[PDB]
Amino acid sequence: PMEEEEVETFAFQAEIAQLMSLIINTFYSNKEIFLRELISNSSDALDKIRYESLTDPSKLDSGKELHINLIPNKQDRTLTIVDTGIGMTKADLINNLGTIAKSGTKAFMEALQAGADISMIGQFGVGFYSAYLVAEKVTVITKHNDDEQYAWESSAGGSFTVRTDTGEPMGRGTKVILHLKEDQTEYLEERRIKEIVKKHSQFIGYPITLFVEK
Numbered sequence: 001p002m003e004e005e006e007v008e009t010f011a012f013q014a015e016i017a018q019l020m021s022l023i024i025n026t027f028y029s030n031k032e033i034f035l036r037e038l039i040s041n042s043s044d045a046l047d048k049i050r051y052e053s054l055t056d057p058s059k060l061d062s063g064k065e066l067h068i069n070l071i072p073n074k075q076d077r078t079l080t081i082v083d084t085g086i087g088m089t090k091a092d093l094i095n096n097l098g099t100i101a102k103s104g105t106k107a108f109m110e111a112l113q114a115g116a117d118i119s120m121i122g123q124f125g126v127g128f129y130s131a132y133l134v135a136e137k138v139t140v141i142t143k144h145n146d147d148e149q150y151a152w153e154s155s156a157g158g159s160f161t162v163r164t165d166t167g168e169p170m171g172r173g174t175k176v177i178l179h180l181k182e183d184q185t186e187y188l189e190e191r192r193i194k195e196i197v198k199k200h201s202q203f204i205g206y207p208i209t210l211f212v213e214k
């Protein structure tokens with residue numbers, strides 16, 4: 001039986017839209033930091049679960065390990081970062097992923113104009129959009145205990161959609177899927193991934209596993 005999904009489209013906040021064109025339309029060295037940003041966001045989500053214990057012991061009764069999986073698919077040209085963190089409600093995606101102003105956006109854009117390293121992006125409050133250094137389209141699937149499963153997705157161009165995901169259930173947590181641009185396939189190689197997690201993500205307080213296709 002055919003399933004029905006409601007799809008809502010939203011504008012990026014003006015400055016975030018602008019930071020996004022800048023990220024996509026300019027060359028930057030050191031684009032590898034995108035993974036560091038996605039891992040540290042997964043790692044934060046995992047911390048939330050740890051402390052969510054204290055606000056209601058209920059969350060103690062979960063079986064899932066707290067961890068991060070990296071999954072390259074060369075057939076598809078995707079890189080997926082999966083965590084079992086706290087996930088996000090519909091409201092959270094809309095508010096946290098593109099609609100609401102961050103104070104550091106304009107500062108970041110001026111800094112890059114004066115030639116700062118793209119690596120500074122996390123300290124300006126806008127770490128998430130580093131994904132657009134390597135990917136031409138990002139999908140975020142997420143499931144929070146308070147809510148149903150939602151997919152967020154953007155190819156930039158000024159807006160994003162949120163819909164109910166009636167696909168594969170994922171359980172609590174967040175999956176970030178990057179459709180890599182054609183020039184950026186190095187980041188599907190096992191050795192390159194291990195190199196950059198070694199260099200930039202060495203003090204994450206949770207297990208990271210990399211799945212490699214035999």
Ligand SMILES: Nc1ncnc2c1ncn2[C@@H]1O[C@H](COP(=O)(O)OP(=O)(O)O)[C@@H](O)[C@H]1O
Pocket residue numbers: 037041042045083085086087088096097122125126127128129174
């Ligand atoms: N894997 C994730 N799990 C839960 N929430 C996430 C995840 N990735 C991003 N977010 C949400 O998106 C927001 C934006 O993240 P980011 O752009 O890196 O800024 P910051 O991490 O400094 O808040 C986060 O504050 C978080 O609420």
Ligand SMILES: [Mg+2]
Pocket residue numbers: 037040041122127128
């Ligand atoms: Mg962040």
